[PDB]
Amino acid sequence: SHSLREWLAFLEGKGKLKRVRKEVDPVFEIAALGKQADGICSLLFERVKGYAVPVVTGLAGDRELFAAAMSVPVEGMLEKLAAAVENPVPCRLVSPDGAPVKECIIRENIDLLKMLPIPTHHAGDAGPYITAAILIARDPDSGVRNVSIHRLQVTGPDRLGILILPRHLWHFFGKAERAGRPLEIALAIGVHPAVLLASQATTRLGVDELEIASALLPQPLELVKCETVDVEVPAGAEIVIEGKILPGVREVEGPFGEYPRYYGPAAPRPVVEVTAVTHRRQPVYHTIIPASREHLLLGGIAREAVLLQTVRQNVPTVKNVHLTPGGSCRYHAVISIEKKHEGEAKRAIDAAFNSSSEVKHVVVVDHEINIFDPEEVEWAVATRCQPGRDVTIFKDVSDKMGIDATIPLNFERISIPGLDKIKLADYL
Amino acid sequence: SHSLREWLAFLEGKGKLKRVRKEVDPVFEIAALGKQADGICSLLFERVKGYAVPVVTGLAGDRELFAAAMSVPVEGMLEKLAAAVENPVPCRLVSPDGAPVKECIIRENIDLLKMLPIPTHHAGDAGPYITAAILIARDPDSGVRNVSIHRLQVTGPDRLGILILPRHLWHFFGKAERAGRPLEIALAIGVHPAVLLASQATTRLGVDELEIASALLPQPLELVKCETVDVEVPAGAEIVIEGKILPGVREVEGPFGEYPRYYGPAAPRPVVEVTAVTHRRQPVYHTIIPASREHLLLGGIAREAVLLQTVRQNVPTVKNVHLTPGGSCRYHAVISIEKKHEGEAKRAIDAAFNSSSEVKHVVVVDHEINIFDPEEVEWAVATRCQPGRDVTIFKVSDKMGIDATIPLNFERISIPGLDKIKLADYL
Ligand SMILES: Cc1cc2c3c(c1C)C(C)(C)CC=[N+]3c1c([nH]c(=O)[nH]c1=O)N2C[C@H](O)[C@H](O)[C@H](O)COP(=O)(O)O
Ligand SMILES: Cc1cc2c3c(c1C)C(C)(C)CC=[N+]3c1c([nH]c(=O)[nH]c1=O)N2C[C@H](O)[C@H](O)[C@H](O)COP(=O)(O)O
Ligand SMILES: [Ca+2]
Ligand SMILES: [Ca+2]
Ligand SMILES: [K+]
Ligand SMILES: [K+]
Ligand SMILES: [Mn+2]
Ligand SMILES: [Mn+2]
């Protein structure tokens, strides 16, 4: 119930899952074929050289599918996401007996690369990477639960290197290693997209992203206890890897192809020792190809929800916001307003820059411009921006720019009568 | 030989011409159906309500077809066009006997709307407009020949309103009206796309765009004398309308749906009296739908050729230029350079702004960015522009330059085998 498998069923019946029955190499070929499907359809690789386990990529690659994953029309997606962040819903603990992720359990002679078709994605990558695992951990002093997604380099049979940015997991790990103790974690792979989307919520220090996922789903998310660590994982996941981040240890992780289409450099980083693996009988392995639409939209939609709220606080006339793919759904923002007073553009711009330190470039347009169409936003810039009046620059870590491409308060688009009414097919 | 009719044959055998056998109204419906084919294929309307004459639109709607019209691959289009501008080739004057455009000649009781299926394109338009006529005229003092395309409002049986922007024809007409004389002109409709493309060259004051067209074609363009005016027109055109712009007369022309997807406002403007119409037996009438890909690329390609040359003068490391469709193939420029020294971005920007008054926004990127892909240019701006260092603003329109090149002293991620492996062969 609201598992990856049901999501794959939903995609199949919509003709947005295609299978690939011919054998593929997990080294580069999965990523290469996945890139050609980016944004059009999900691919299920039924034969991966060296493995009985299939690989799925591109579960959702456009805003219509993420809206479907949340049971909303596109129009309501951002508000539904912000409502889930504001009002989390408890998860239900469930028995391990009959939980699909407990069907097979491995505690000895663990070899991750032997069990799982973990791909190698881009040319410069140090080796195979796990890119779609939600990482569940608890604060070792306050006990609160956090979920985030981290790249994990497969460095041995039972060892992973992990990039941890200075956010919540880092805070937890900091506390474990001041006490000289490991931090217990669980990794879950093959979950519903709503759960992945929930793992990208940026919140204050103590809100459990699994509870956010619970609010987005039709029923509460069902959890089960791990075998070897005191952590909870989604009962319906495909695969769970249990382990611990080792105190003090630093090993070289990287380099790795990342979201902005550049390499993340190699450096000494924490290490996870894996103490168990559990999975469904005949699991599906999910990978996210870095810088794909799936990768960009996961974080993007979450950042857009926050951006809409921040901008709406200061500019109640805001109709919509979009973090463009060109900007890695992060650096570039387009904001539509139903403008009433001159001065609204500047306020929307100032608000976008407080949404996150990442936003670098902001364009503001009138409500009738479709901000999801780059050609129409460019047209609005071309015809409605006078740069001496309409451009502000922030100099001083990143420079930033704001562009007011709204019509001044005191421009009708040309059209052809009959164009909705008449179809070229009926005349040929 | 290198007529509109041969061009339509070339499009048919490439599956890029579709015929429309059902009757269509020239008022709005041609434009509406044409807009749905914009950029996919040319349409020949075989039955236009009220007329024996068919209408063709969208002769070329992409850079591949304009390259074919010039007998070049896309990669060489801009250089081939600039070479033709630099080295024009004389036209051949030819006898009126046997010239196809002389087959039928009308000198009396001329009613343009009765003879020709002249469309009404957009809702706000003042009436039917001729949008694909090349206008040939000579300087009444220096005698040099010019070609340009002007919208012509059909205002009576033998009368047209004309928008003339302050460029070469304006200069000529200025001189005719200080002498109190009309300016004799000819309008040709239904020509090969190379000729239309040549009419959009922006040159210094005395180079004959018909000679540019001659250089682009496989053999020199054949011209013939007009019946009632001292002007030359293409022998192979479908239709020629002869006449004169009247000295002093000003009548309201407009409004009209234009290139940037806004209405051009109504105002008092010059007027053409028509003194004759000649055509092929059973002519085809060509219309250009305003703001279509055909409209935008005709002007765009010509402005890109000139822009590449101007920028190359000061920045020999320039690889390519693109005027984006977002900017109406006019306002927004993307310039790729193989950068050697810091400072090349600023020089490319400063040169683009002197190329033409119209360019408003310039982005400079490294040679490996595909400048025809807006998402990849945006990505370059997102990752390689620091606006405190990389944005210059010039203060009629303000202008902005963006340097989105890598600073000199950033590898793009990639997947081995991606050219070699095809999704269709695996599913
Ligand atoms: C969706 C997604 C998010 C990644 C991510 C990727 C994906 C697909 C990759 C797997 C393909 C590779 C890089 N990732 C990392 C990352 N954060 C981090 O600290 N280390 C990472 O390696 N991020 C961002 C991180 O998951 C989010 O910013 C979290 O919301 C942080 O959560 P928190 O606020 O609870 O700490
Ligand atoms: C291709 C094209 C070019 C038009 C044009 C259109 C087309 C389809 C229209 C017909 C559909 C609507 C508006 N047009 C006009 C126009 N120039 C002008 O002075 N008045 C106009 O009405 N332009 C631009 C003009 O033809 C070019 O700038 C010439 O190169 C100017 O030539 P010149 O340098 O010899 O003066
Ligand atoms: Ca503005
Ligand atoms: Ca730069
Ligand atoms: K999170
Ligand atoms: K011209
Ligand atoms: Mn958190
Ligand atoms: Mn000229």
Short mmCIF file of N, CA and C and ligand atoms in Angstrom, two decimals, chain B residues 339 342 384-386 389-390 403-407, ligand 4:
data_model
loop_
_atom_site.label_atom_id
_atom_site.label_comp_id
_atom_site.label_asym_id
_atom_site.label_seq_id
_atom_site.Cartn_x
_atom_site.Cartn_y
_atom_site.Cartn_z
N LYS B 339 37.82 31.06 -25.95
CA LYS B 339 38.51 32.15 -25.27
C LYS B 339 40.04 31.88 -25.10
N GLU B 342 41.60 36.82 -21.09
CA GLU B 342 40.50 37.47 -20.39
C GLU B 342 40.34 38.78 -21.12
N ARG B 384 28.52 30.08 -14.22
CA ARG B 384 29.71 30.79 -14.63
C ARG B 384 29.57 32.32 -14.65
N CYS B 385 28.42 32.87 -14.28
CA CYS B 385 28.26 34.29 -14.18
C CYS B 385 28.20 34.70 -12.70
N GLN B 386 29.10 35.62 -12.34
CA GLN B 386 29.09 36.30 -11.04
C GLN B 386 28.73 37.75 -11.37
N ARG B 389 30.99 41.04 -11.13
CA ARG B 389 32.08 41.03 -12.08
C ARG B 389 31.62 40.93 -13.54
N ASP B 390 30.54 40.17 -13.81
CA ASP B 390 30.29 39.66 -15.18
C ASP B 390 29.14 40.33 -15.97
N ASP B 403 28.78 37.98 -19.10
CA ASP B 403 29.98 37.12 -19.41
C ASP B 403 29.80 35.83 -18.66
N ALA B 404 29.39 34.78 -19.35
CA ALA B 404 29.19 33.51 -18.73
C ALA B 404 30.29 32.53 -19.20
N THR B 405 31.49 33.05 -19.47
CA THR B 405 32.65 32.19 -19.72
C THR B 405 33.37 31.80 -18.43
N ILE B 406 34.01 30.63 -18.49
CA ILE B 406 34.89 30.17 -17.43
C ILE B 406 36.07 31.16 -17.27
N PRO B 407 36.34 31.63 -16.03
CA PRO B 407 37.57 32.49 -15.84
C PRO B 407 38.87 31.70 -16.10
CA CA C 4 32.18 34.61 -16.13
#
